[PDB]
Amino acid sequence: VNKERTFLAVKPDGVARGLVGEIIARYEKKGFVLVGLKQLVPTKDLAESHYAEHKERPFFGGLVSFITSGPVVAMVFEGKGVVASARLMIGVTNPLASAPGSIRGDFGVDVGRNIIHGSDSVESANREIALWFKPEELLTEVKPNPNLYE
Amino acid sequence: VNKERTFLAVKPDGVARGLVGEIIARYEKKGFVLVGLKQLVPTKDLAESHYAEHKERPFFGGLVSFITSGPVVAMVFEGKGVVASARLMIGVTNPLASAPGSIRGDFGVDVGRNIIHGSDSVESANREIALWFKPEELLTEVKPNPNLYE
Amino acid sequence: VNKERTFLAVKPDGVARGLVGEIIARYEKKGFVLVGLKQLVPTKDLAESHYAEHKERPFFGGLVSFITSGPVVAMVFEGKGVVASARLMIGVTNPLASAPGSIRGDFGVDVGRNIIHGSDSVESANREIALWFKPEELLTEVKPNPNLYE
Amino acid sequence: VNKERTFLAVKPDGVARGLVGEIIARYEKKGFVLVGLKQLVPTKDLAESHYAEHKERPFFGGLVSFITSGPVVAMVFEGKGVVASARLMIGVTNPLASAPGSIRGDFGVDVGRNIIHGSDSVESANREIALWFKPEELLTEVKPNPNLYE
Amino acid sequence: VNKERTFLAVKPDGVARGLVGEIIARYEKKGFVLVGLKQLVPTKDLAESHYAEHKERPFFGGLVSFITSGPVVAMVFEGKGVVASARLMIGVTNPLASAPGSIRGDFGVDVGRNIIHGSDSVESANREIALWFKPEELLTEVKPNPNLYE
Amino acid sequence: VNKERTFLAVKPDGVARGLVGEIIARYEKKGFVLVGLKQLVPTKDLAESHYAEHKERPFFGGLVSFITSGPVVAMVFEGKGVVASARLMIGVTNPLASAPGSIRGDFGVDVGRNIIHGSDSVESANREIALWFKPEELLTEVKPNPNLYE
Numbered sequence: 078v079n080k081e082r083t084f085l086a087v088k089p090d091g092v093a094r095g096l097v098g099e100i101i102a103r104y105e106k107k108g109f110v111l112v113g114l115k116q117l118v119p120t121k122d123l124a125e126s127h128y129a130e131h132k133e134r135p136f137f138g139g140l141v142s143f144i145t146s147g148p149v150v151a152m153v154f155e156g157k158g159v160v161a162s163a164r165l166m167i168g169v170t171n172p173l174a175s176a177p178g179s180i181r182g183d184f185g186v187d188v189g190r191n192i193i194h195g196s197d198s199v200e201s202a203n204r205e206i207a208l209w210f211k212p213e214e215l216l217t218e219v220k221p222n223p224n225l226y227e
Numbered sequence: 228v229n230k231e232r233t234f235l236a237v238k239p240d241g242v243a244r245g246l247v248g249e250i251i252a253r254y255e256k257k258g259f260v261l262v263g264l265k266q267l268v269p270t271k272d273l274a275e276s277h278y279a280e281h282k283e284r285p286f287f288g289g290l291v292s293f294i295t296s297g298p299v300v301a302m303v304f305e306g307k308g309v310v311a312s313a314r315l316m317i318g319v320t321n322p323l324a325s326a327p328g329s330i331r332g333d334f335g336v337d338v339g340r341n342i343i344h345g346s347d348s349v350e351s352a353n354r355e356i357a358l359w360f361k362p363e364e365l366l367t368e369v370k371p372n373p374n375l376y377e
Numbered sequence: 378v379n380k381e382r383t384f385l386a387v388k389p390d391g392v393a394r395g396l397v398g399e400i401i402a403r404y405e406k407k408g409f410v411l412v413g414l415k416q417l418v419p420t421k422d423l424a425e426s427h428y429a430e431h432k433e434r435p436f437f438g439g440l441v442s443f444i445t446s447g448p449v450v451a452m453v454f455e456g457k458g459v460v461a462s463a464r465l466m467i468g469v470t471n472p473l474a475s476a477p478g479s480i481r482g483d484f485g486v487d488v489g490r491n492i493i494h495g496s497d498s499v500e501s502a503n504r505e506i507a508l509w510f511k512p513e514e515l516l517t518e519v520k521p522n523p524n525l526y527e
Numbered sequence: 528v529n530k531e532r533t534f535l536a537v538k539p540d541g542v543a544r545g546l547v548g549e550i551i552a553r554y555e556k557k558g559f560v561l562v563g564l565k566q567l568v569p570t571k572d573l574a575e576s577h578y579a580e581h582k583e584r585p586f587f588g589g590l591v592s593f594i595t596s597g598p599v600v601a602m603v604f605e606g607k608g609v610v611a612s613a614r615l616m617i618g619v620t621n622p623l624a625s626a627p628g629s630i631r632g633d634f635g636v637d638v639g640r641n642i643i644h645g646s647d648s649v650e651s652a653n654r655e656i657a658l659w660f661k662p663e664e665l666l667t668e669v670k671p672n673p674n675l676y677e
Numbered sequence: 678v679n680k681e682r683t684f685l686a687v688k689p690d691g692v693a694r695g696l697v698g699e700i701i702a703r704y705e706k707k708g709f710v711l712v713g714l715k716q717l718v719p720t721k722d723l724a725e726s727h728y729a730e731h732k733e734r735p736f737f738g739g740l741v742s743f744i745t746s747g748p749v750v751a752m753v754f755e756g757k758g759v760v761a762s763a764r765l766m767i768g769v770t771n772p773l774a775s776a777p778g779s780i781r782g783d784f785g786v787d788v789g790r791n792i793i794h795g796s797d798s799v800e801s802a803n804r805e806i807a808l809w810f811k812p813e814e815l816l817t818e819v820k821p822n823p824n825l826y827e
Numbered sequence: 828v829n830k831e832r833t834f835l836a837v838k839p840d841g842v843a844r845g846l847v848g849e850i851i852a853r854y855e856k857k858g859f860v861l862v863g864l865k866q867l868v869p870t871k872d873l874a875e876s877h878y879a880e881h882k883e884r885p886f887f888g889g890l891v892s893f894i895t896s897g898p899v900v901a902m903v904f905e906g907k908g909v910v911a912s913a914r915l916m917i918g919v920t921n922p923l924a925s926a927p928g929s930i931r932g933d934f935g936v937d938v939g940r941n942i943i944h945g946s947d948s949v950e951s952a953n954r955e956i957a958l959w960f961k962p963e964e965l966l967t968e969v970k971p972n973p974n975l976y977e
């Protein structure tokens with residue numbers, strides 16, 4: 078349904094490099110509605126929890142540290158197939174393998190500093206959202222440009 | 228030869244969402260010459276005739292209505308391999324499956340409202356052109372940036 | 378009223394330099410609705426008539442010749458104070474005195490090749506329109522983004 | 528000092544027309560740091576309090592309603608002379624009289640729907656900020672591109 | 678004559694902030710031809726000589742130091758009235774006072790780090806050019822888009 | 828290592844069509860540092876040597892001729908995996924087969940005039956670089972945005 082949602086978060090490197098508006102604009106132009114938005118610096122707790130499935134991976138160490146080394150613009154978009162489209166638009170893990178046109182492909186270079194995070198599945202979406210956003214912070218209703226869907 | 232032409236038409240949603248300029252600019256930046264251009268509201272007759280090959284398809288119903296529910300910017304471009312290139316740049320039918328950088332992949336979200344139409348073969352081009360444009364409305368001669376071809 | 382109209386025409390140099398979409402996009406982004414659009418090569422008659430008020434000026438010679446030396450994308454936009462806003466966005470006669478942000482300021486250099494024409498007054502608007510467009514070629518109705526006006 | 532801050536808020540039409548990203552990007556490109564950001568629907572109380580100085584003005588009626596008829600992206604930027612600069616970049620009250628390059632001059636058309644609001648004085652900034660943002664939602668420290676200041 | 682030239686130089690902050698391409702593109706779009714281009718780190722000797730006219734000015738110390746603290750992309754453009762046009766495009770000394778649309782107005786914030794330098798007069802152009810480019814490094818001939826001048 | 832380098836060169840058509848700034852900006856946005864830059868007209872000697880590997884290929888004649896028919900903007904970028912990243916960004920030989928988003932895919936149409944050249948391997952990079960730049964013209968040190976690498 079045209080009410081699917083995903084969790085996106087411009088990480089400390091996207092924020093510091095001034096890529097917040099560019100990244101948001103790409104999604105707005107696509108047709109997805111912003112449903113929640115806010116800036117905060119993640120806590121170790123939030124980072125670990127957010128990155129739970131990578132608990133015993135060599136990189137989990139650095140993920141947690143960096144994602145809490147500064148402000149993060151957390152956000153929630155909504156729209157048909159937003160979870161698949163978002164990831165698609167984001168690119169692939171390694172910015173260097175990301176095709177031009179995608180976020181990481183156009184702006185990224187080191188997997189350590191790959192600008193943004195997008196939920197991988199509606200399952201991780203629903204969890205990630207409920208982790209970063211008090212339900213109060215999300216639009217109870219949404220009306221997309223009528224020229225978007227049939 | 229560097230004289231092939233394709234028919235393109237920003238559909239009611241492209242036009243209504245204000246994507247006429249961006250769409251044209253993308254092909255102008257590519258190296259193709261506008262040989263014709265015009266805005267109008269297609270008639271049931273033209274829509275049906277335009278969508279002939281999909282007469283007995285479940286969606287044809289909605290195709291003809293929508294493409295006539297408002298203004299359409301019909302246009303004809305020219306240049307080497309313009310037909311294959313236009314489609315590539317337009318993306319795939321479902322905007323969600325269209326790669327970033329393509330028209331439908333950057334601004335589309337529903338198959339029902341997918342912004343633009345490009346001729347799929349030189350065969351359909353020749354026909355589609357002849358349908359929307361009286362031959363008088365088309366450049367009898369063209370001169371592209373000399374820096375474009377060899 | 379939000380129904381005022383103006384006549385714009387990307388001249389042979391804007392067209393040849395590939396500035397059609399860029400110029401159209403600027404107006405679309407502003408909030409004005411396209412009401413008519415078409416491409417044609419002006420005839421000596423049309424040029425002279427169009428440039429009537431400059432009949433005995435040293436430059437009238439060249440204006441007429443050049444504006445008929447190639448295709449011209451004639452168009453008609455609509456919206457509140459479109460005639461004043463259009464000119465504003467176009468810039469001033471001499472591209473070099475045109476501030477950055479305007480069309481001529483960003484793209485122009487020689488007054489001889491100043492990319493575009495915009496009607497100077499609603500009076501010249503109403504005349505110019507009726508000169509370049511058979512009434513049939515203009516939308517009988519218009520519905521702008523409801524987010525545009527109050 | 529390089530710590531001055533101003534309050535900005537993309538109004539319902541900016542948000543609805545999908546201009547959140549572009550607006551933010553313009554200030555990010557300028558050199559200012561986002562110290563706070565969030566989206567919400569203002570309450571009659573906040574709108575009235577926000578528009579206090581215009582209590583007995585004919586338009587105040589519509590100001591409070593509209594700014595509460597939908598989501599608003601409130602945000603706080605920081606940097607040298609940010610208040611005077613923001614306003615300059617925003618343009619003048621009437622979007623039609625706003626020069627190209629400014630926000631209102633590039634995308635606005637009606638005084639009623641003029642996209643964004645910027646604090647007019649450091650005095651109103653300090654107040655406006657304190658109204659929409661709990662001090663917890665604001666960066667306690669900021670570090671701008673070292674290439675920005677001397 | 679359409680062969681006047683000016684010396685432009687992206688200072689260390691423009692270079693470090695990644696504004697080289699944007700700045701060149703702005704002039705390329707305008708109509709001016711690149712006649713010389715190169716990246717180098719100014720030597721104290723060159724900075725001093727280049728800033729000769731401000732020898733005993735308070736800021737002279739920092740101008741020389743900063744402009745040699747890193748790579749500068751020196752360039753020479755050519756075109757009718759380029760010197761007055763480049764300056765207009767660059768904006769005014771204080772980036773805060775630069776109108777949106779201008780280089781300094783779109784990206785600068787401190788007078789000390791104001792991105793780029795443009796010759797002030799044809800007098801200074803001829804001089805400045807002769808100072809940073811060996812005559813061999815400048816095009817002996819130039820052919821601008823024929824759609825540019827009359 | 829984040830110090831790998833590649834040789835890029837905007838060919839005469841990219842230079843003449845005014846794509847220099849756009850092409851540099853694309854790489855600047857990606858994360859790569861400009862380490863050398865300059866504009867020159869290739870001599871037959873250099874074109875031949877540069878195209879050595881295609882000595883007895885049918886197209887070799889035109890490659891050498893065309894690349895010396897005008898100014899070429901030679902440049903050397905630096906960054907982790909730049910050689911494979913630059914190539915990806917450039918697209919594939921036939922601009923018609925280049926995906927949208929890539930340089931050749933966004934602006935090129937003929938294999939003969941395909942805008943830019945990027946080294947194919949670090950082997951060719953080291954060689955090509957050594958051929959168009961005297962070691963003195965390349966930065967002896969580089970400091971990329973700290974928000975780029977881990």
Ligand SMILES: Nc1ncnc2c1ncn2[C@@H]1O[C@H](COP(=O)(O)OS(=O)(=O)O)[C@@H](OP(=O)(O)O)[C@H]1O
Pocket residue numbers: 131136140170188189191193194195
């Ligand atoms: N090698 C390495 N070094 C550092 N950080 C890394 C590395 N591999 C993965 N990551 C980041 O951790 C998340 C891994 O998600 P993936 O599903 O892409 O894992 S994998 O790398 O593809 O195996 C994912 O973070 P988010 O995308 O922010 O969720 C990766 O970007």
Ligand SMILES: Nc1ncnc2c1ncn2[C@@H]1O[C@H](COP(=O)(O)OS(=O)(=O)O)[C@@H](OP(=O)(O)O)[C@H]1O
Pocket residue numbers: 431436440470488489491493494495
């Ligand atoms: N010196 C000179 N040489 C060539 N062409 C010229 C010259 N002066 C004006 N024009 C063009 O003619 C129209 C004149 O309109 P203006 O009202 O601007 O006249 S004036 O030049 O300001 O006196 C106007 O054309 P449009 O803008 O296409 O209507 C000018 O661009």
